[PDB]
Each structure stands twice: as C-alpha cells, then as structure tokens.
Design a protein around this motif. Sequence first.
Motif, PDB file in Angstrom:
ATOM      1  N   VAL A  37      12.731  -0.318 -17.942  1.00  0.00           N
ATOM      2  CA  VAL A  37      11.349  -0.051 -17.522  1.00  0.00           C
ATOM      3  C   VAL A  37      11.028  -0.799 -16.226  1.00  0.00           C
ATOM      4  N   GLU A  38      11.029  -0.096 -15.097  1.00  0.00           N
ATOM      5  CA  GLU A  38      10.915  -0.759 -13.798  1.00  0.00           C
ATOM      6  C   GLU A  38       9.491  -1.132 -13.421  1.00  0.00           C
ATOM      7  N   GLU A  39       8.532  -0.299 -13.811  1.00  0.00           N
ATOM      8  CA  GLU A  39       7.120  -0.592 -13.591  1.00  0.00           C
ATOM      9  C   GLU A  39       6.315  -0.294 -14.851  1.00  0.00           C
ATOM     10  N   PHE A  40       5.543  -1.271 -15.312  1.00  0.00           N
ATOM     11  CA  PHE A  40       4.690  -1.111 -16.488  1.00  0.00           C
ATOM     12  C   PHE A  40       3.259  -1.478 -16.100  1.00  0.00           C
ATOM     13  N   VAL A  64       0.834  -1.200   0.000  1.00  0.00           N
ATOM     14  CA  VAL A  64       0.000   0.000   0.000  1.00  0.00           C
ATOM     15  C   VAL A  64       0.876   1.260   0.000  1.00  0.00           C
ATOM     16  N   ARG A  65       0.898   1.949  -1.132  1.00  0.00           N
ATOM     17  CA  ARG A  65       1.810   3.058  -1.312  1.00  0.00           C
ATOM     18  C   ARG A  65       1.175   4.399  -0.932  1.00  0.00           C
ATOM     19  N   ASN A  66       1.516   4.974   0.224  1.00  0.00           N
ATOM     20  CA  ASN A  66       1.112   6.385   0.460  1.00  0.00           C
ATOM     21  C   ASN A  66       2.013   7.396  -0.271  1.00  0.00           C
ATOM     22  N   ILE A  85       4.523  -8.285  -6.174  1.00  0.00           N
ATOM     23  CA  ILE A  85       4.938  -7.117  -5.428  1.00  0.00           C
ATOM     24  C   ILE A  85       5.914  -6.348  -6.311  1.00  0.00           C
ATOM     25  N   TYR A  86       5.659  -5.057  -6.496  1.00  0.00           N
ATOM     26  CA  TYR A  86       6.491  -4.229  -7.371  1.00  0.00           C
ATOM     27  C   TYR A  86       7.572  -3.472  -6.603  1.00  0.00           C
ATOM     28  N   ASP A  87       7.610  -3.702  -5.287  1.00  0.00           N
ATOM     29  CA  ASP A  87       8.390  -2.889  -4.353  1.00  0.00           C
ATOM     30  C   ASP A  87       9.604  -3.593  -3.739  1.00  0.00           C
TER      31      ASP A  87
HETATM   32 NA    NA Z   1       9.889  -1.102  -8.231  1.00  0.00          NA
END
Ligand code: NA
Lengths: 379, 383, 381
Positions: free
Chosen positions: A218-221, A177-179, A375-377
């Motif tokens: 490209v880190e997030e698509f 959950v990204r604030n 998970i992209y994090d």
């Molecule tokens: Na990332």
Amino acid sequence: NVIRLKEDKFREALRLSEYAFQYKVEDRLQQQITKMKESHEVYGIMEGENLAAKLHLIPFHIYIGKEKFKMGGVAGVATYPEYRRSGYVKELLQHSLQTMKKDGYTVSMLHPFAVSFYRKYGWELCANLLVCHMTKSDLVMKKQVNGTVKRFNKESHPEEVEKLYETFAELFSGMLVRNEKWWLQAVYDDLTLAIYYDENQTAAGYMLYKIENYKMTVEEFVPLHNEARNGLWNFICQHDSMIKDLEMTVSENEPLLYTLQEPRVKTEIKPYFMGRIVDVEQFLKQYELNWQEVILHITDSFAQWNNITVRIANHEITIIEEPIDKGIKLDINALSTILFGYRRPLELNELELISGSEEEIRAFESVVPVRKPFIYDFF
Amino acid sequence: MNVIRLKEDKFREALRLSEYAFQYKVDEDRLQQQITKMKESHEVYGIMEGENLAAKLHLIPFHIYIGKEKFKMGGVAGVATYPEYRRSGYVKELLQHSLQTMKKDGYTVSMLHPFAVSFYRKYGWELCANLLVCHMTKSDLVMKKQVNGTVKRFNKESHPEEVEKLYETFAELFSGMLVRNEKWWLQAVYDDLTLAIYYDENQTAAGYMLYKIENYKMTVEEFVPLHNEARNGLWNFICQHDSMIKDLEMTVSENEPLLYTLQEPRVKTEIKPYFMGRIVDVEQFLKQYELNWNQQEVILHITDSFAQWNNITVRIANHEITIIEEPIDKGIKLDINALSTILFGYRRPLELNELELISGSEEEIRAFESVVPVRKPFIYDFF
Amino acid sequence: NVIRLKEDKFREALRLSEYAFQYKVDEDRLQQQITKMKESHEVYGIMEGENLAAKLHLIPFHIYIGKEKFKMGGVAGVATYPEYRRSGYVKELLQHSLQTMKKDGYTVSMLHPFAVSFYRKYGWELCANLLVCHMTKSDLVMKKQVNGTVKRFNKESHPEEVEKLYETFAELFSGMLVRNEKWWLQAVYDDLTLAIYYDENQTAAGYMLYKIENYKMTVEEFVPLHNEARNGLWNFICQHDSMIKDLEMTVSENEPLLYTLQEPRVKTEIKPYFMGRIVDVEQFLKQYELNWNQEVILHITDSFAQWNNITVRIANHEITIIEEPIDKGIKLDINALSTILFGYRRPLELNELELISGSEEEIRAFESVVPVRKPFIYDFF
Ligand code: NA
Ligand code: NA
Ligand code: NA
C-alpha cells in the motif's frame, strides 16, 4: 562553466544517468527525453568534448499548510568517476541555487544518495516515511461502514481524487502540488487506486496499492476522516484470503495501528527527503507563524544572500542590517528543518546546533507552527 | 470469592507455572533468589483448582515519575494460567481482584507488559509507552568532535551511587519511568550488562549507558546523557570499540536526537509499542497531577466498566480539579483506556478524537489538548 | 610507564583479555591461563591511576629458518580498554617490547594481527599464508593402496616420533615454531586427534591433526614427508567416508594434494595469516645464510626501531655495516626487509610495487641472494 543542456546532449545525459544509477532503460528512452524537454531544466559541465556531470532542476510547487510555495526540485545529480577529482557537482549545485533565487524559488527539495553530501551545502533532512508491516492475522474488520469503495487505474483517473489529495496535503508541510499530468505520469506507476465514498456518494479517502506473490503493498493511504479510514481498512480486510503480508507507507500522524487487535506490529521510521530554504527574506514573506520577539542570526556558507539577521515581531518580518549580539544564531540547515517542522527549536538546541538564551529559545519554539512535514512523492 | 494471597510454601509451585508459561528453566541457584524476591517485593495472588494452583498474578509495589512528581504505581506481573484451566477465565478474576486491592491500598496508577494488548484493553488498560530500537553497522561509528571528559566502566559489584541520580534526572523528563532504588538496580537492572559513566572535565558524572558485547555485536540497552557533551562523550566511547564490532543496537526513547547527528542518518529504526498503563483512581490521581494552565472550561465524563469508582464527571477549571455530582450532558465523553493513555502523554486528545474514541465539540477538545502536558511517556524497565 | 606485571595482576589482565576479545574463561580453566602466563609469558602493562589500561605479552620462542633456529619474540594478547585508546598506550608497549627483544637477543618477532594496517605502521609485515580447502563426500575417492599403516593418538598417548616428523617438515620452511614436548601438549593438541602413517618398515613418514564433529572432519595439520605418506593419510581420510559430508584442510601453499583429486576444482582459498618483523637487523643477519651462486648494499629505514636505520654491506660472502654516507644502493624499509627475508614477497615483486628502489643490477642481485625458501607457520598464539 555551467551550461544549460540542449536537446542534442540529452542522450549523453541519460547515458550518465544510466551509469551512475546502474540501470538500462530503448522505447521508454524517448519518454525520458520528453519528460526532460517538457518539465526539467537540465544542467551540465563539459570536460573536453564530453559531459562530465549533470544536475536536473524540476519546477514544482509544495504545500506548507494551505500556502503554495514555488519549490525547485533537485534531481539526477551525477558525475562520471574519472571527473570526481574536479568536483563538478559542487559548481552545479551552486549554480542551481543562483538560478532558483533568480526565478523565485524560495524552497528546494531533493532525494539524497547520501545525506552528509547535501548537508554540506545547506540541505537538511526534512521528512520521514513510516513503513509498517502486518500479516493475515492482523486483518480484523472494524464495524461495518455505510459507504462504498471503488477501483480505478491510470486510464480511469477520477478528477475527484485530486481534491482528496489536496485536502490531505494542506495538513502538512512539503507535500507536492500534483496536477493531472503528474498523477498520470508519476503517481500510478504499476498501482491500483481505490476511493471510499460516504453514504451520499462523497469522496472521503483513497489508497494506492498493488498485490503480487501474496503481498499487498500500500503506497499511499489517505483517509480524510475515521469513517474513510474504517471504510478503507475493511476493504483491505476483504483481501484476507489473497494476502499473507501487508506493507503500508504512511505519515507519523496516521493513527491506524493503534486501532488493531495487536498494535505491536513491525513499524519503521525512515528519514526520506531533504529540503532547503533558498531565499530566506523572500521565504518568510510567505510563511505564517504563531503569535517577547524573535531575532534570528542566520548563517549560510553556500548561498551568500542568506547571511542575514531577521526580526520576527508584531506580525512582521524585517531585516536588521547592522545587528547586535543578541538573539539566536543558527545554520541554514537548522532554519530549513525547523521551518518544515521536522525538528523543533528545543531539539536542535539540546543538540547545540542553534544557540540562544533559555527565554529566546522558548519564544522561537512558540512561533514555529506545530504542523508536521510529509511528502508522498519521488523525484 | 476465589482468589487467595499465596503464602511462602506455594511460591515454588508458582514458579513451576511461571517456567511453563514463559518457556524458560530457572537455574537451581537462581530459584531461592527468585523466592526471596517474591517474599520481599511481590504480592502473589492465585486461584486454586482443588489441590493445584491454576492461575496466578503478581502485584509489585512500585512508584513512577510523572514529571518531577512520584505516583504510587501497581506493577501487574507474572499473569499466567495452565492451558488445561484456561477455559475457566481465572485470569479475568485475578485481574479484577488486583484492581480492588490496588484501590484499597492507595495506588493511583498501574502498569504492565501484555501477553496480548487486546486482553488488557478490555479491563481498562491502554498502551502508554514505546521503545525505539535502532541498528547501525561499523561504518556508522564515526567520531564526533572530542570532548574533555572521560568514561569509566562498572559492574554489579562496583555499583556507583551517582548512576542513581543520573537516572532520576533523566526519568523526570518523562511520564511512566520506574523509580529505582539500589536493590532494584542490583537485582533487576544490571542483569548481564556493563555500566559506563561519562564524567566531565571535573570528574563529575554527566551521563551513563548500559550495554553488553557478544559475537561482534554491541547491544546498548540503556543510553542516558544529561546534555550534548555527555552524548558525544558516550558516543565517542561506543566508537572506540570500532575494531570490535560489526553491529550495534540501541534502545532509546523517540525523544533521543542521537540519530539525527549520524553521518548517514537513514538507519534501521523501529518504534515498538511496549508497555500498558491504567489509572486506578481518577480522583486521587488528578489530585497529584499537574496540568497546563495558560483557556476555557473542560468537563470529562469518565466511563470505567471494571472499576466503578472511576465512573465520575470531572471539572478542569480555574486551577482546581473539581468533581461534579449533577448529571450534565455537556463536555467530553471518554473511557478509562482513553483517559489513561492521554494522561500518560502517549496519545493526544486530538488523536483520539480523530479516531472517535473520545467525543466533544472542536472547541472542548481544543482546550482538553491544551491542558494535558506535552511531556512524553517512557519506561526503561521490565517486570 | 611500562611495568612488567607481577603474578598478582594476572587476573586483571585476563579481564582485559575477556573484554577486548569477547569471551568468558571458565571457572577451573582460569587457573591454567594464570599458570601459562607465569611459566612462559612476559606480561607487560601500563597503568592509568590504579587500573590496568593496556597490555602486551611477549612469549619466548624459537623458529626454523631452514635448519637454523632463530630466537623469536612472539607478540600476543595486545589489548587496551577503549576508554584509554586516545592515550596510545599500545604504541608505548610495542616500542617497549622491541627494546626488550633487542636486549634479550630476540632477532625476529611474529604475531597474529587483529588488523594488519595497525602493525605495519610499526614495522611488522605479512610473512605467511594459510591454504584452506573444502571437499565433500564425493571427493573422498580412494587412491592406490599402500603397504604402510596408520595409528591414532591423543594428548595422553603423545608419541615422541611425531616431534621428529614435525621438525623435518618445519626445516623446509621459514617461520615454523620450534615445538618442545610441552608446547605440543599444551597448545597443539587441544581437542584434536593425532594420526600417524608408518611405512613398510614401520618408520613414521607423516602425520595429521583432525577432529570430526557434526559430519565435518576438520584437518588442522596435514604433514606427509613423502607421497606414500600423503596417499596413506589420504586413504585413512577416505575410510571416514560414511561419517562425513564435509572435509576441511589447512595446508601450505605448496601442498600438491589437490592436484591429485578426481575433480581438483574444489573450494580453495589462500589466507594471509601471520606477520613478522626483524627486530635487530645486524644481529639477525649474523645467522641468516644467503645464496652466493654482484654488489649488494641496503639502506634500511625503520621509523619505529631507531637502531635499525643502517646501511648493510653484503658481498664477498660477508656481512658489514657502512657508517659512511653513499646514495648508491637499495632503499627499503623494515617491513620490506622483513617480508623479503621470510621469503613472503620477492625483491622483484616489491620493486614492481615501488616499495623498494634501485637499479636493475642491484635488484636482480638482491633477488639472487635471498634464498627461495617459502614461509609458513602451523601454529597460533
Ligand atoms: Na508515492
Ligand atoms: Na533496560
Ligand atoms: Na595449527
């Protein structure tokens, strides 16, 4: 034994961090200090006057579908080699489990230096990243799309990219959950954001990327529909004169490659992150399944309180106090990976890591939702 | 109007084209062996430009497993042309021809390995199977708990008939696996590789693998256990080579769980799209094809631009697969590519909807997704 | 269990050699392996069912320990198919090879290890290094000219005089193979070229074995008896300067040649190479000359060859065996005795390394009696 480190011992902690992970951070040193005060719970063990081992517990939340789960992020686990014979990390990991149970963390996630080490204490692999590489020739445009693409940096952070992200994340299990604060401090690093907007200026997909020495990384698509996917692809294609190599990190559920002129490109599946169920009874209180019955005999050798037998029946979850020899016997590792969607009951059964009658497995396979983890994090 | 079925005297000339197109030189001994092969188990078609063979295509009669069911499959191979002739698009003609022949002969499905995916996409084929290749190092070779069985080794001249049933029981788990007779094993599978079978306590075969070892590297090209005991069995056998190998390379399906069980499961693991498949006759194909009945009607409007007999509307209801003559606007519109890759299990109706290569209501597609079996496509052979 | 393989199974044995060692022997060259094995090998095996499971070759040899020739049992081609590794048949074979060597009168054993840690468990120890150094074109600088000449030879031109040259060299060391004419032709030559330096008097003084390919000269044996020969051979290497970009040389740790270069800081590595084991201590010591230039008693352990668990009395210029118990003295194992007696690791070192125990008195005395000869072996099997 285990003490919560206070502000004074933070420089010492970071000296152990610097040693174990072979980096040298001086001005950016105060960022680390701050991050630790502001959003970490740092735990250590002393030997004599010296800090011998550390663990960080970061309070997080994750998406399992639309449902938000309090999730305890384990990070910066480390010990000086001279104190390795003492096995201080074990003590710390046990302590973090007790802290998590106590604070209401039902689920935990970490990035392993080694998998076998956390496997030992109940964490299990729970998510992959797909990394695929293409070249200039692969950059063929699809049909022209009507909307517009716009570019942003940390300073121009648009609040709307957060909604886009949330919509994406709710499709999976284990997304963070990204604030706003997270976005700025952790997501952008050295990256550039680009959002595709539809015909009537609605945000519809985003990407995070960088370009250096002729490589776009490209880190997030994140496209919410095919139009967005198409819009963003075309945007990438418009860089064709600048780039020789393209690298993209995506989920296994991303169908982009299939659409290429030559889909046989280099594509690697890397197991990435590990997860663990901390408080089972409290976890299943929140977890929605799909709807003869299912009895699970769960074992957990590091967290005593997960040694329970559970009854999944009639839209309900109940604990069988004195159970009988019937149902599925499984491991906390197995339960954790199963409920993230990373491995299926049938798979772990073929592998002999869970047990039950043919019928009983079929029933279990049917209740666990089909939603895939991601998970992209990083932490 | 141009295509001929090549007769025996031209087979040699066809091989000079094969060698040119696939950049290899056949050993003089193998040449007659490649001719026999072609005489016996291939139908070789070509187009002449005056005096010379300009282009060619082999149609290999095959059968494939889709689950337990055997479908007559048309293997398209050796598709080639000389560069001086490439301007005339003889290959398009040959391929359109093979389709007409395949229908005539009662093939329901066809498979090929593409020189270019884009090329065969246009004439109805889609991707239908991937290979997963993975690379380990010596330190990955850690023994699993001991099993009570044993492994024996074999070569072409020692071909054990139990391997055939080991294969068959594996293949039946997938869609698209090739049906292998003794001749095929002997002539097409062993190559330069070694066979190793795992036998249980009772000296009963339970799994096999095909591999070679050169310059400190084991390449395992086929790994086929029937259950976990045989997986550990073969794994521990691989491990017993620890002194011999720096590098290990395995080709498996994306369904092979072995990786998960490794001490450090983060190894190099790559999924390469491998093979393409096409449904030749929908009506005949669906008559053999078991669906998953457990919740509303599903209509399919099938478009095939290069095979006009597949331009039909299909009704999937009750337990029958019926055909609808009356032109109705209701239901899913998809093409033969989409339909082939769906029925192979390679891509899901849901995936192709998100990609907008098929179209219908959320509900219509939900029920489509529901009826198509969850089985996974795979092929372990090359032709 | 262990059988001495007959002619008829040599083909099967080679299939195991081809497997374990990853190579394909030629059509015609297959027969030369069969011959060699008939002629000069004792090939041992264990069967599982009808199949050959594991094998060991014992090759009858002799070696130089100084001027004294010792009968040596060379262990070669040890292998097992992996599906039998659980059975520990190689152990059974090694044990058996020891008994044979005992009975036949082999006093010492040498082998080239696929893995050292494996053979140590059974009493073999490292006993010889190789020194490999690499030079480039700019290193081939001519020395002062010498009066002698160099002649080239091949397998078919084999000159008897190289044999005496080798012997004179060999005798300065411990572990060198005794080389008959047959060994020379069938194992030493290979694809190599023999060059010999002759002095003013046309007396052979030194030799080399080398091959030149793709601008790299590989010198596999470099054997000058004196400095004139060293120089002469070296000048001959330098005349190849327009032909080579890289020069590789294998020499003994004690070959001073590099010191003489313009820039002696070239790539140069010492490689542990070969392993040795004393098979029968009592019988080996009857031949082994020592240095008497004060009491030296050795308690020897050998967990694999039982007949070697003895205490040796060495003193008064004499060799006896003490049946009587006494804890006074040096405790060492067969690996320690073996490496010390070859001259690979001194007693003093092995003491500092806590691999042998005793008082300073006894150790310094022990260090005194073991001769200062350095070990070396130019051969491979
Ligand atoms: Na990332
Ligand atoms: Na294969
Ligand atoms: Na040599």
